[PDB]
From a paper:
The resulting acyl-CoA enters the β-oxidation cycle, being initially converted to enoyl-CoA by an FAD-dependent fatty [name] (FadE), followed by sequential hydration, oxidation, and thiolytic cleavage reactions. The [name] enzyme has a broad substrate specificity, being able to use both long- and medium-chain acyl-CoA substrates, whereas FadE2 exclusively uses medium-chain fatty acyl-CoAs. [name] (601 residues) and FadE2 (592 residues) had the same overall fold (with the backbone RMSD of 1.001 Å) as other [name] (ACAD) superfamily members.
Consistent with the AUC data, each asymmetric unit contained two homodimers arranged along a crystallographic 2-fold axis. In the structure of [name], we noted some additional electron density, which did not correspond to any crystallization additive, but was consistent with the presence of a bound fatty acyl-CoA moiety. The acyl-CoA substrate was sandwiched between a probable catalytic residue (Glu441) and the FAD moiety. One FAD molecule was bound in each protomer of [name] and FadE2. The His6 tags were proteolytically removed, and the molecular mass of the resulting native proteins was assessed using analytical ultracentrifugation (AUC). This revealed that [name] and FadE2 are likely to be dimeric in solution. The first ca. 460 residues from both proteins comprised a pair of α-helix-rich domains (the N- and CI-domains) separated by a β-sheet domain (residues 160-280).
Numbering used by the authors:
A (entry chain B): 3 to 601
B (entry chain A): 2 to 601
The structure:
C-alpha cells in the first residue's frame, strides 16, 4: 500500500536545500510558514494514500470507455476528483488574483510528487490542467484569464495541450490543423489531433483545449504555428459551460499502460477558438505549457523508482528463498529473507540511489522555478533561468530512463511473482514506459540539451552547475568524512567540461556528432548531477552524525547509499564517455538499404 | 511489415561462420541432414512461422486464455495451428528414430525454434515445453515409459509440462512439499499444488504429460529428497491412448503482464497416479536434462525479442519522416527526412542489430556442442563440448534475455509515442520479453550458477575452454590487416577476463558475499566478451569473403560496420561491470535490513 516518503521529502527540502530560508527570501512566501507547509504536505499525503492510491489498480484493469457521447473514467476516478476540487488542491500554486492560494510552485511540486506515485494516470487529469494555466497566465489577455484561468484554478474545468497529429509529433512545423479567422475576430479550427491526454472524460464541467494551428497564409514550419483556446463548452453569460463547441472524441487508444488516462483522437469541425499570444508565435507561447510538464514528467521518472523501491523493500524482507552465502541468518525459518542475497541488495540500492538522488535534483530545480516566477533581482532570475534550461532536459530524460530501470528492478526482486498483475509491480513498469516517449522523447531531449543549450552557448549553460560542484569540492576537500566522494567528484567535474569541449570540436568537423553524442552526453550529465547530490547528502549526513542526532540510522543510510552510488552506479560514466568519444562514423557509415540484408 | 524469418543470417551463421556442413558429416546419425534437406526444412519452417503462427501473435495477446472448472480455452487459431504443426511432423524432427522421430540433429530443431519464438513465443511454449519432457524421458525413462509417453510426445499428439514451482518456492526447490505415496502396484499417488505451470491445461492436444517434482515419505531434507514423477492428465488405456481421467485439474490461470496466449496454471494433484522416473531422491539430477534444454531454449527467447524489435524498428525508421538530417535535408523532395538519418535512431537500430546477430552466432556455436554431447563417440570431444555448454548455457540464458529486453525497448523507442500503442506489436514484444529474465532461472540465479558453481568451483578452469578459442583467434589474426582493429581490444579483454576471474576468486577467499556481489556483473561482462569474439570472427569472415569477391558485398560490408559499432559503443559497458565487481561486497552488505526504508 502506497506510503508517502514525507521524512525523505523533509530531508531534501528542509535540511539539504534550506527551503525555510528560500521561502523567507522570496516575495509571496510569508503565508508559507514551516508549520503550514508541514500541514499541507501531511494533508497531501493523506489524500494520496487514502483516496487515489487505492484506485491505481482499478484504473489499470478498467481503463476508460469510449462512446459517441463521451468517455467514462475508471470506477472512483471522478469522485476522487470532486474530493481533490473540494480540498482546493487545484488552486494551491496560482495567483491570489485569479482565485488561487498564491503558495509557491515548489510546494505544488511536492504534492505532485505524491500524486504521481499514488496514481499517475489519475494525476495527469489535474497535471495537464496545471500547465494550461501556466500558459493562460503567461500569454492570455485579462479577459481570457477571467473566463478560462479562474475555472482551471478552481479545478471545475480541466485543460489539455493539443499539438500531435498522425504525421507529426516531434516535427510540429509540419502540423496542418487550420485556424480560419472570423469577422467577430474569433477562429474556426478544423483538424484531427491524436494522443490527446484527458481530451474527453466525465471528471469536470468543461475542458479547455490549448491547440496549435496555422493561420491561412502563415509561413512554413514552426514560424507558421499559432496557439488557440478551444473549450468543449463555450462560456455562457455567467461564465459557465454554455453552448457545445464542435470538438469531439472519435476514439481512445489501446495502450501498454496508463489505461486510466483517456488518450483521445480529438476532431475539431470548425470549432470556435480564440488566439492566445501573438500570431505565428504559438511555438514560443506553448513552451510555458511544455517546460512545466518537462519537470512534471521528470516527476514521473521519480515516481516509478519510488513505487519500485516501496514494493521491493517490503517483499525482500518478507520472501524467504535460499540461504546467505555466509551461513543461515534465520536458521529458525525454512529459508533466509531474500534481502540477505548481495544481488537483491544491489537491486534495492539501485532503486534507492535513483529515488533519493532524483528527489534532491528535482527540489533543487524547483527552487529555480520559484526564483524565475517571483524574484525581483534580474541577476538572480537570469541565473535561475539558465539553470532551469540546463537541468530541465537532464531531469526529464535521465529520471524517466533510470525510473524505468528502477521499475524493472522492483519486478526482478519479486522473481516470477513480479510478472503477475495482482502485485502492481508490472503495472509500474507499463506506466513507466510512456515517460521516455512523451513530453519530448529521450532522443529529442538529449539533442535539446547538447545542441541548443550547451553547444549553442559554447558551454556556458554547463558552467552554472559545474561552478556549484567546484565550490563543493573546495569547501569540503579537507572534510575527512566525504574525502572519498570529493576526489572522484572533482575529477568528474573536470572531465564533464573537457568532454563538452571535445564534442564541440568534433561537431565543428562533422555536425552528425551533436546527434552521435547527444544521449550518451545527457546520461553522463545525469550521473554527474546525482554524484554531486549524493556527495552533498553524504556531507549533510556526516554533519548531523558528528553533532549528535535522534536519527543515527537515517543519516548512516544516506552515507551507505552515497557510497553505493559512487562505486557501483557512477562508473556507467566510463561507457557513456567511450561511446561519445567514438565519433559519428560508426553510426553513419552503414547505408539505409544495408541494415536488413539477413532476410 | 509482418514477421520475416532471418534465413539469410541463419545460413551465414551456420554454413559460413560455424562450418555446419562439415560438423554434420562428422557426427553419427547426421547423414540425413544433407545441405539441401536442411535448406528445404528451413524454408518449410519459415513458411509455417510467417503464414500460420505469426498472424496469431496479436490474437494470443488480446484474448489470452479462458479458464473454466472443466478446462482452459486457448486463443482463437492456436489449436488449429497446433494441428497443422502436428500434421507437418515438426515435433518429431529432432527425436530418435525408434520412438517415432526423424532423428535429425538438435541444432536443426533449434533453427525451427528460433523462427517459432520470433513468430509467436506464447504459442511456441506449448511444443517447446513438450521438447523438454521428451529429452527427460529419453535420458532417464524405462523402455516401457518411453513406449507409452515418449512416442505420443514425439508425434505431438500429447504435450508435456515441467511441474517444479509451489507458492513458497521457485529458486529454492529444496523446500518443495508435493508428496508421492507408494501404492501396492508400484505406481504412486501425487498430492500437492503446483503454481505457474506453463501449458498446465489447454485444449490443443489429446493428453498432457506432467513431469512433477515430489517427495517420497521418508526422503532426506532439501534437494537430496526430491524425486521425479510422470503424472498424465489421462492415464493410458490398453492400446496406449488417452483413457481414465487422472486426478489432475487446473484450479486457475494467472493474469500476467504478457505471454497471455500461454496458459499459466495452478495445477491441483489430488492423489493423481504417477510413475517414478529416474532413481528415488535423484529427481533434481534427472530434471536438469529438461532444465538446460529450456535454458538454451530461454536464451533463444532473448534472441527472439531482439530480432522482433530490429524488424519493427528498421521498417519504421525507413518509412517515418520526422525532422531533417543534421547535415542538410537528405530527402528535400519530401516534407521531412526518414528518421534513419538521425544518429540516435541509427544507434538504437545498430544496438538491436549487434545483439540479434551476435547472439545468433553465440546460439549456434552452443548448439554445435549440444550435438557433440548427444552423438559423438569420442570421449575427449564429448567432455570438452559438455564443459563448454556448462559455461555458455547460463551466459546465453541471462545475457541474451537481458539484452533482448533492452533491444525490445529500443524497438518501441524508434516508434516514439506510436510504440506505446497495442496496434504496432512493439509494446507486446516488451511485455512478452519481461518474463524471460524471471523464469527458467532468474538472472541473479544464472549469475550465481556461472560464477559460484562452474567458474570458482573449477578454480577458473570452466572459462579456459572459451578463452583458449579466443587466444588462438587473436594469434591467427594478429597480422590480418582487415581485422587488426578488433584483434587488439579482443586480446586485451580476453586477458582481463582471466585476471578478473582470479581477483573475484581472491575476494571470495576473504568474504563469501563477494560471489553474489560480483555474480551478475561477471555474467554481463562474460556476455559482452563472448559477443566481442563472435563479432571479431564474423568481421574476419566478411573480410575473407570480400577479398575473394562476392555477389553480396553489401551483406558482408554490413557485418564489418556492425562489428565496429559493437566494439566502439557497446563493449565499453564492460568498464562499468569491472568497476562494480571490483568495488567489494561491503557497499552492498553494510546497510542493516531495518535501515533501507527510513524516509516514510
Ligand atoms: C504530464 C503528462 C505528459 C503528457 C503530455 C504528452 C506530450 C505532449 O503534450 S506533446 C510534447 C511536445 N513535444 C515535445 O516536447 C518534443 C517535440 N517537439 C520538439 O521539442 C521539437 O524539437 C521542436 C518542435 C521544438 C523543434 O522546433 P524548432 O523550431 O526546430 O526549435 P528551435 O528552433 O530550437 O526553437 C524554436 C523556438 O521554440 C522555443 N523553444 C525551443 N526549445 C525550447 C526550450 N527548450 N525551452 C523553451 N523554449 C524553447 C523558443 O521560443 C525557440 O525560439 P528561438 O529559436 O528563437 O530560440
Ligand atoms: C521453452 C519454454 C520456456 C518456459 C520456461 C518456464 C519453465 C520454468 O520456469 S521451470 C524452471 C524453474 N526452476 C528453476 O530454474 C529453479 C532454480 N534453480 C536453482 O536455483 C538451482 O539450480 C537448484 C535449486 C535446482 C539447485 O539447488 P542446489 O541443490 O542448492 O544446487 P547444487 O547443490 O549446486 O546442485 C544440486 C544438483 O543439481 C544439479 N545441478 C545444479 N546446477 C546444475 C546445472 N547448472 N546444470 C546441471 N545440473 C545442475 C546437479 O545434479 C547437482 O548435484 P551435484 O552438485 O552433486 O552435481
Ligand atoms: C509466466 C511464468 C511461467 C512459469 N512457468 C513455469 C513452469 O512451467 N514450470 C515451473 O516449474 N515453474 C514455472 N514458473 C516458475 C518460475 O520458474 C519461477 O518464478 C522462478 O523459478 C523464480 O522463482 P520465484 O518467482 O518464486 O522467485 P524467488 O525464487 O522467490 O526469487 C525472488 C528473488 O530473489 C532472488 N534470489 C533468490 N535466491 C537467491 C540467491 N540465492 N541469490 C541471489 N538472489 C536470489 C531471485 O533472483 C529473485 O530476484 C513460471 C513462472 C512464471 C512467472
Ligand atoms: C500516451 C500518450 C499520450 C500523449 N499525450 C499527448 C498530449 O496530451 N498532447 C500532445 O500534444 N501529444 C501527446 N502525445 C504525443 C507524444 O507527445 C508524441 O508521441 C511524442 O512527441 C513523440 O512523437 P511521435 O510519437 O510522433 O514520434 P516521432 O516524433 O516520429 O519520433 C520517432 C522517433 O524518432 C526520433 N527522432 C525524431 N526526430 C529526431 C531528431 N531530430 N533527432 C533524433 N531523433 C529523432 C524520436 O526520438 C523517436 O525515437 C501523447 C503520446 C502518447 C503515447
Amino acid at each position: 500500500d502506497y506510503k508517502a516518503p514525507l521524512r525523505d521529502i523533509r530531508f531534501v527540502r528542509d535540511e539539504l536545500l534550506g527551503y525555510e530560508a528560500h521561502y523567507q527570501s522570496l516575495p509571496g512566501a510569508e503565508d508559507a510558514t514551516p508549520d503550514m507547509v508541514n500541514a499541507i504536505l501531511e494533508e497531501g499525503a493523506k489524500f494520496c494514500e487514502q483516496v487515489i492510491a487505492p484506485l491505481n489498480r482499478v484504473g489499470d484493469l478498467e481503463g476508460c470507455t469510449w462512446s459517441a457521447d463521451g468517455v467514462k473514467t475508471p470506477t472512483g476516478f471522478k469522485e476522487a476528483y470532486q474530493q481533490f476540487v473540494e480540498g482546493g488542491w487545484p488552486s494551491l500554486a496560482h495567483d491570489v488574483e485569479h482565485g488561487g492560494q498564491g503558495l509557491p510552485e515548489s510546494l505544488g511540486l511536492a504534492i505532485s510528487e505524491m500524486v504521481g506515485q499514488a496514481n499517475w494516470s489519475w494525476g495527469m487529469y489535474p497535471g495537464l490542467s496545471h500547465g494550461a494555466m501556466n500558459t493562460l497566465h503567461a500569454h492570455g489577455t485579462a479577459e481570457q484569464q477571467a473566463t478560462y484561468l479562474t475555472k482551471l484554478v478552481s479545478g471545475e474545468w480541466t485543460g489539455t495541450m493539443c499539438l500531435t497529429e498522425p504525421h507529426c509529433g516531434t516535427d510540429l512545423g509540419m502540423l496542418r490543423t487550420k485556424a480560419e479567422p472570423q469577422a467577430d475576430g474569433s477562429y474556426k479550427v478544423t483538424g484531427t489531433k491524436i494522443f490527446i491526454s484527458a481530451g474527453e472524460h466525465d471528471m469536470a464541467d468543461n475542458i479547455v483545449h490549448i491547440v496549435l494551428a496555422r493561420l491561412p497564409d502563415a509561413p512554413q514550419g514552426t514560424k507558421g504555428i499559432s496557439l488557440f483556446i478551444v473549450p468543449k463548452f463555450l462560456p455562457n453569460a455567467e461564465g459557465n459551460a454554455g453552448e457545445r463547441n464542435a470538438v469531439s472524441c472519435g476514439s481512445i487508444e489501446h495502450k501498454m499502460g496508463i489505461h486510466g488516462n483517456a488518450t483521445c483522437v480529438m476532431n475539431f469541425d470548425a470549432a470556435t477558438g480564440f488566439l492566445i499570444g501573438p500570431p505565428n508565435k504559438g511555438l514560443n507561447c506553448m513552451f510555458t505549457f511544455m517546460n512545466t510538464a518537462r519537470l512534471g514528467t521528470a516527476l514521473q521518472g521519480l515516481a516509478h523508482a519510488e513505487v519500485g523501491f516501496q514494493g521491493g523493500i517490503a517483499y525482500a524482507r518478507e520472501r524467504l528463498q535460499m540461504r546467505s552465502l555466509t551461513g543461515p541468518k534465520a536458521p529458525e525459518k525454512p529459508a533466509d529473507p531474500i534481502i540477505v542475497h548481495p544481488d537483491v541488495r544491489r537491486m534495492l540500492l539501485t532503486m534507492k540511489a535513483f529515488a533519493e538522488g532524483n528527489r534532491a535534483m528535482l527540489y533543487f530545480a524547483a527552487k529555480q522555478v520559484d526564483i524565475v516566477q517571483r524574484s525581483q533581482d534580474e541577476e538572480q532570475k537570469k541565473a535561475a533561468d539558465s539553470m532551469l534550461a540546463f537541468l530541465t532536459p537532464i531531469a526529464k530524460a535521465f529520471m524517466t530512463e533510470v525510473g524505468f530501470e528502477s521499475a524493472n528492478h522492483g519486478v526482478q526482486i519479486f522473481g516470477g511473482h513480479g510478472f503477475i498483475a495482482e502485485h502492481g509491480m508490472e503495472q509500474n513498469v507499463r506506466d513507466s514506459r510512456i515517460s521516455m516517449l512523451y513530453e519530448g522523447t529521450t532522443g529529442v531531449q538529449a539533442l535539446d540539451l547538447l545542441g541548443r543549450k550547451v553547444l549553442m552557448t559554447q558551454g556556458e549553460a554547463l558552467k552554472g552547475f559545474t561552478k556549484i560542484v567546484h565550490k563543493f569540492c573546495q569547501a569540503n576537500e579537507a572534510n575527512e568524512a566525504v574525502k572519498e566522494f570529493v576526489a572522484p567528484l572533482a575529477q568528474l567535474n573536470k572531465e564533464w567540461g573537457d568532454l563538452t569541449m571535445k564534442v564541440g570540436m568534433a561537431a565543428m568537423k562533422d555536425r552528425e556528432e551533436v546527434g552521435a553524442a547527444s544521449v550518451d552526453y545527457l546520461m553522463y550529465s545525469g550521473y554527474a548531477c546525482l554524484a554531486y547530490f549524493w556527495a552533498d547528502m553524504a556531507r549533510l549526513a556526516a554533519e548531523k552524525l558528528a553533532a549528535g542526532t535522534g536519527e543515527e540510522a537515517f543519516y548512516k543510510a544516506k552515507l551507505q547509499t552515497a557510497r553505493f552510488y559512487f562505486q557501483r552506479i557512477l562508473p556507467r560514466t566510463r561507457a557513456h564517455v567511450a561511446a561519445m568519444l567514438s565519433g559519428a562514423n560508426n553510426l553513419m557509415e552503414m547505408a539505409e538499404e544495408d541494415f536488413a540484408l539477413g532476410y
